[PDB]
Structure 1
Amino acid sequence: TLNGGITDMLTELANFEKNVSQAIHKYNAYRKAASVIAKYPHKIKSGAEAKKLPGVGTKIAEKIDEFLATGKLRKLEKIRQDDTSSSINFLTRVSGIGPSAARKFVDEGIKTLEDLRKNEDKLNHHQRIGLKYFGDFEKRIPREEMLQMQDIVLNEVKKVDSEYIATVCGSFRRGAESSGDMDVLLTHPSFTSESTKQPKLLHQVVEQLQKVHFITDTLSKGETKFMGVCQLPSKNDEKEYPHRRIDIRLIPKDQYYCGVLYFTGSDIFNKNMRAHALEMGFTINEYTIRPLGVTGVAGEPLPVDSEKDIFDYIQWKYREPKDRSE
């Protein structure tokens, strides 16, 4: 929060470029800059000082100068007048409404929350649930509730089959005092990169979590990625807990360490890590790390036996989860 004014401005420019401009590389460029500035341990006192950080160039440099002078950015102040872009910015906050869908709706005069509640007949399934719980999904989750939710999930998974292993990742695994949502990695020994010895492996888990009314809704659901809603249960005559987004990813047991690296994040850390893999001649995904040949075709899975082996392959010394929150 040392440069909180600057990083907010860049995050607002990043969401603008992403939601309105549909310019995904400007969005990342602003995010990376927001990120390197966020971890810089001095109160930034000029744009040129900031341009010294990789990912701050000339244009962000001018903007930081202006912000530091007036406490505002005109480019932003305008963008908020523009009713079309503030309408688009708003609709994208409903889960399942992305930049294209938002601009489409706006083009039909569906611009506000009341607009969306009239026209649920014009929303796919994900969008329906995203509007249903629109408010709940912007509340964070206190870590103590993450700990409750963890316990239900791990105990309920233990009851389906004692050989499941469920790890909660995301910001929770990075030590966060709060989390936007819950991310669960699931492994079962009969699902490997070699065979799928048992069917409905993930389905059994969500079915059981539904049985105890922890999972309340589904956004999408395949045989390895579930994406939906959960809610802690409350005792007698207390206000309901909010509903929470939950994602569960079934990863092959022998690919646990790439899987847990991917799901621990952050997304930006993942991005910077995989990028630097490429400059060392590796490609990292949630399953494997492989070398690149001279043609750039991915070779075959290098053998991994811990998170740290992946970091070793690519010239980085290990970084504990709590230091991956870029």
Structure 2
Amino acid sequence: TLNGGITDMLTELANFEKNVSQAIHKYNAYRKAASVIAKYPHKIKSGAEAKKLPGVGTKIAEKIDEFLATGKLRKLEKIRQDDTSSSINFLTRVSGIGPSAARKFVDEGIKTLEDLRKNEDKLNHHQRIGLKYFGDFEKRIPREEMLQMQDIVLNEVKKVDSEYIATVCGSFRRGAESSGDMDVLLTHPSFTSESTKQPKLLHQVVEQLQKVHFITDTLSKGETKFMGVCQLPSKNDEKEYPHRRIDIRLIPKDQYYCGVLYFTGSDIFNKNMRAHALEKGFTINEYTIRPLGVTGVAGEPLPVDSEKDIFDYIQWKYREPKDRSE
């Protein structure tokens, strides 16, 4: 990019603080710094210049001119040499293994992929599927396959019931040329804030996607969130496509604009936009935007009839999805 070396540095520090230190506020601070610096349209020449940016304090600036000077960071050098810290970091890359689990496995001998395979019976379901597909889930999905997946999802959802609206969100909706997984926002007229008429809407769609063998495994499933695994069909004598993570959120139809704002992200965009909401006296979740009273507790949902309405409430210029990749 432009300051790739600095933003990789903060990212790696962010990952270490989350996974090893289990310090998620340092994790988020590091991630905030990485993204504003990733915005910032000049090559950073000193830490003092960077400290001018919101979210960059003294510690990070000192690390920046340490990195700017030598092209490395001693703190990261020894984090990378700590075989324990490196092993914790590695194990968290398995879907279902987080800081706590990864740490347990290391404290009891399990440090490598090979060690996990021999110890499959200490893994919950999610972890087990995450291990089975560890190689595939490290792979990114080219927008071209995302297009086939969408075609499949939107077509099978149309088959169950023509009133379902299915919307691919995440980095796909933001125009990325590759995505990490597939995020599908589902709505249906029979499910609103004031009334759920038919239930099992989400299950109706998941079962039809498994029946046609698109969805292959389940990680978690409830009445409004499906997290699982899918796979494009391949041709005769063709290597298979990698298996892919897929998430489906069933959101009430009258709440689509907040849902689609939440599910389009990016995650950092959502965190900054929601923090600005609070500074203007509002709270945003995937469902509603609500005032904070003079007490400081949420009131009634405000009428929303477009994504732009949410931006207007907090007095932000509309940002098209392509510009929400923070």
Q: TM-score, normalised by structure 2?
A: 0.99
Residue 88 of structure 2 is matched in structure 1 by 88
Cα distance in 2 for residues equivalent to 1:176 and 1:81 = 34
Cα distance in 1 for residues equivalent to 2:209 and 2:160 = 10
Residue 269 of structure 1 is matched in structure 2 by 269
| Offset at residue 244 of structure 1 (A) | 0.3
| Offset at residue 289 of structure 1 (A) | 0.3
| Offset at residue 84 of structure 1 (A) | 1.1
Which secondary structure state, in structure 2, belongs to the residue aligned with residue 135 of structure 1?
A: helix
| Offset at residue 203 of structure 1 (A) | 0.4
| Offset at residue 143 of structure 1 (A) | 0.3
| Offset at residue 305 of structure 1 (A) | 0.3
Deviation sequence 1:179-207 (CA, Å, 0-9, x none): 00000000010000011111210001010
Residue 302 of structure 1 is matched in structure 2 by 302
| Offset at residue 83 of structure 1 (A) | 1.3
Which secondary structure state, in structure 1, belongs to the residue aligned with residue 300 of structure 2?
A: coil
| Offset at residue 20 of structure 1 (A) | 0.4
Cα distance in 2 for residues equivalent to 1:3 and 1:273 = 24
- % identity of equivalent residues: 100
Cα distance in 2 for residues equivalent to 1:306 and 1:199 = 26
Which secondary structure state, in structure 2, belongs to the residue aligned with residue 65 of structure 1?
A: helix
Deviation sequence 1:282-323 (CA, Å, 0-9, x none): 000000000001111100000000000010011101000000
Residue 249 of structure 1 is matched in structure 2 by 249
| Offset at residue 89 of structure 1 (A) | 0.3
Return 143-152 or 44-53, whichever deviates more. 44-53
* Greater than 3 Å deviation, 4+ residue runs: none
Cα distance in 2 for residues equivalent to 1:262 and 1:115 = 38
| Offset at residue 231 of structure 1 (A) | 0.6
| Offset at residue 80 of structure 1 (A) | 1.0
Residue 217 of structure 2 is matched in structure 1 by 217
Cα distance in 1 for residues equivalent to 2:78 and 2:40 = 29
Cα distance in 1 for residues equivalent to 2:191 and 2:236 = 41
- The equivalences for 1:101-180 within 5 A come to 101-180=101-180
Cα distance in 1 for residues equivalent to 2:62 and 2:56 = 10
| Offset at residue 211 of structure 1 (A) | 0.8
Residue 69 of structure 1 is matched in structure 2 by 69
Consecutive unaligned residues of structure 1, counting only runs of 5 or more, are none
Deviation sequence 1:100-128 (CA, Å, 0-9, x none): 01111111101110110011111000000
Which secondary structure state, in structure 2, belongs to the residue aligned with residue 229 of structure 1?
A: strand
Aligned Cα RMSD in Å? 0.6
Cα distance in 2 for residues equivalent to 1:133 and 1:13 = 27
Which secondary structure state, in structure 1, belongs to the residue aligned with residue 249 of structure 2?
A: strand
Return 49-58 or 218-227, whichever deviates more. 49-58
| Offset at residue 86 of structure 1 (A) | 0.6
| Offset at residue 39 of structure 1 (A) | 1.1
| Offset at residue 49 of structure 1 (A) | 1.1
Deviation sequence 1:26-52 (CA, Å, 0-9, x none): 001000100001111111111111111
How many residue pairs get matched? 326
Cα distance in 1 for residues equivalent to 2:104 and 2:238 = 41
Cα distance in 2 for residues equivalent to 1:52 and 1:159 = 54
Cα distance in 2 for residues equivalent to 1:313 and 1:186 = 25
| Offset at residue 21 of structure 1 (A) | 0.6
Which secondary structure state, in structure 2, belongs to the residue aligned with residue 316 of structure 1?
A: coil
Cα distance in 1 for residues equivalent to 2:98 and 2:230 = 22
| Offset at residue 74 of structure 1 (A) | 0.2
Cα distance in 2 for residues equivalent to 1:199 and 1:303 = 25
Deviation sequence 1:193-249 (CA, Å, 0-9, x none): 011111210001010000111000000000100000001001111110000000000
| Offset at residue 5 of structure 1 (A) | 0.6
Q: TM-score, normalised by structure 1?
A: 0.99
Which secondary structure state, in structure 1, belongs to the residue aligned with residue 54 of structure 2?
A: coil
Deviation sequence 1:76-109 (CA, Å, 0-9, x none): 0001111111110000000000000111111110
Which secondary structure state, in structure 2, belongs to the residue aligned with residue 290 of structure 1?
A: strand
Q: Does 1:36 align with 2:36?
A: yes
Residue 79 of structure 2 is matched in structure 1 by 79
Deviation sequence 1:55-90 (CA, Å, 0-9, x none): 111100000101111111000000111111111000
